[PDB]
From Swiss-Prot, chains A, B, C:
TNFR-Cys repeats lie at residues 21-61, 62-102. This is Tumor necrosis factor receptor superfamily member 10B. Disulfide bonds join C5-C18, C21-C37, C40-C53, C43-C61, C63-C77, C80-C94, C84-C102. Monomer. Can interact with TRADD and RIPK1. Interacts with HCMV protein UL141; this interaction prevents TNFRSF10B cell surface expression. Two TNFRSF10B monomers interact with a UL141 homodimer. Three TNFRSF10B molecules interact with TNFSF10 homotrimer. In the absence of stimulation, interacts with BIRC2, DDX3X and GSK3B. The interaction with BIRC2 and DDX3X is further enhanced upon receptor stimulation and accompanied by DDX3X and BIRC2 cleavage. It comes from Homo sapiens. The chain holds residues 77 to 184 of 440 of the full protein. It is linked to Squamous cell carcinoma of the head and neck: A non-melanoma skin cancer affecting the head and neck. The hallmark of cutaneous SCC is malignant transformation of normal epidermal keratinocytes.
Length: 109, 109, 109
């Protein structure tokens, strides 16, 4: 369809005009259909930067191994399970965003 | 924006950012729009890894020779038959998933 | 004779032998038949171990005085109030698990 602007640029309401956005102000990752540019993400200590932010790129935030990010916490990472629940076993990997996996097999019938 | 992310990627809670997932830590097979990355599958002793997983692949498990596993019973392997009782003839190959094949012979007496 | 190992011991994949697990490295509360032993619980900086884990026991974590946390939270602790709002009274104690308690007008005459 029409009314779309390439990355780093945005299109007006009337769709007959597109304006350029400045490096570092705001960015667009995919063809945008708005008059504004999206805010760029920044990282803080305890987190690792994987990719740069630019009119054609987005900054990536990642958390250090051993910690996890749950939807119940804001830009925070928590220590993964330090021991599966009583009657379970270790089998899953912990990702800065997801938690470990525990499985029940031998513990009361 | 629609809010969809390609395979191997996830979208943060804010819906305006998409981040890459690490090989073996987790992946996505089909287009998704969540802050979660799909966990990778692991196999246990007695079973071998047929194909490791990546940001665009799923891990498969294998059973050692002499065992069998039908789609009707997962996470289970059973001893494959080495020869049908007298009267039957072995003619099929045994695969960690399927069992041998036996056919009745009219020849003889 | 059997395929079971007592608490504090794990068994090999072939079941022909069982290896002993030692306190502080891992433990088991009930009989089991696995290759690994149940992990011992450790606490992060700012938290203390209330009770260590032995070959037959599990370790509990505690948070330092002045901070508080509910069982519903992962393991974060918050600073208890050192003075109820203006026109309030102090009457409850703050425990790393519980928060301070404030009351209005102790008693009249």
């Amino acid at each position: 369809s029409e009314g779309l602007c390439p990355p780093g640029h945005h299109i007006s309401e009337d769709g007959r005009d597109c304006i350029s956005c400045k490096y570092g102000q705001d960015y667009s990752t995919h063809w945008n259909d708005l008059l504004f540019c999206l805010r760029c993400t920044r990282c803080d200590s305890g987190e690792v930067e994987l990719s740069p932010c630019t009119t054609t790129r987005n900054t990536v935030c990642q958390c250090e191994e051993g910690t996890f990010r749950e939807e119940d916490s804001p830009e925070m990472c928590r220590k993964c399970r330090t021991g599966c629940p009583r009657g379970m076993v270790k089998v899953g990997d912990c990702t800065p965003w997801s938690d470990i996996e525990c499985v029940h097999k031998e513990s009361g019938d």
